[PDB]
Amino acid sequence: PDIFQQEARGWLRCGAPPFAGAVAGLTTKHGGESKGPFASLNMGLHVGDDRTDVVNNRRRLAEWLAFPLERWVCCEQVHGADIQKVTKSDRGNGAQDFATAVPGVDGLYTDEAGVLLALCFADCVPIYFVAPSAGLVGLAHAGWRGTAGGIAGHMVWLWQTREHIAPSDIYVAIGPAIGPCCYTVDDRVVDSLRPTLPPESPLPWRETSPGQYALDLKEANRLQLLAAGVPNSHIYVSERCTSCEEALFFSHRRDRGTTGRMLAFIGRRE
Ligand SMILES: [Zn+2]
Ligand SMILES: [Zn+2]
């Protein structure tokens, strides 16, 4: 069974055992207030939807999780590889007004309880991190650009060098994202990813016609995490494709660029 399992409402819980001490999951597209291409549980404030509808969708998740919206922390998600540590003093940033989101970063982490890290997705890879003994949680957004920038390994490096956590103490869930079944890219994308993988590494793409590659970004990020020292048995990977599973997910690719966003979230209850 997939590591992300359907709950009673419009969300999937991360069921990997090391995440049992955390509130961790990904929303699905149903149960909200938004309309048209955003129907209905659009969590993204940056996609041209009605802000009142989106805030109400966020308040609905907050009720399902018993984790108030005033305790969430969001980031700008610029498709880079930068990451910021956040604390209770950052609560609310980007929760109801996109302009207050943490600027210039694509991942967040915290060692405090009572802080819900909250990032938006509709094909890019959500990477959830936990160090259960040390009380750290993290969440990163990795499309091809962030993966080429090594965002996954950057989280591990920060936890090692700034938080004094060995990679062997980290566990990771790679959530629903677009699969190689649906994601075809050109030489420039794969050429950007090549230097981020070990020289002996199997390549997470297949050339399906000249200059066209079926790309597996989940696997690219898993390989980077392995190279950064996270143990194989600590990395859980969802098999759900956001483009294929149209009944559950918004997909930037399938929906031709105008669609909602799911929210990936992780935090610990205070
Ligand atoms: Zn993205
Ligand atoms: Zn697919």
Numbering used by the authors: 2 to 271
Authors' description from the paper:
Here, we report FAMIN as a prototype of a new family of multifunctional purine enzymes conserved from bacteria to man. Consistent with DUF152 containing all enzymatic activity, recombinantly expressed DUF152 bacterial proteins YlmD and YfiH metabolized adenosine to inosine and adenine, MTA to adenine, and inosine to hypoxanthine. Crystal structures of several bacterial DUF152 proteins have been determined and revealed a monomeric α/β/α fold (Kim et al., 2006).
The His47 side chain inserted into the purine-binding pocket in apo-YlmD (semi-transparent representation). The His47 side chain may act as a gatekeeper of the active site that rotates outward when the substrate binds. Atypical laccase activity has been ascribed to some bacterial DUF152 proteins based on a spectrophotometric method that monitors the oxidation of proxy substrates (Beloqui et al., 2006). In a sensitive LC-MS method (Perna et al., 2018), laccase end-products were only detected with a conventional laccase but not with YlmD, YfiH, or FAMIN254I.
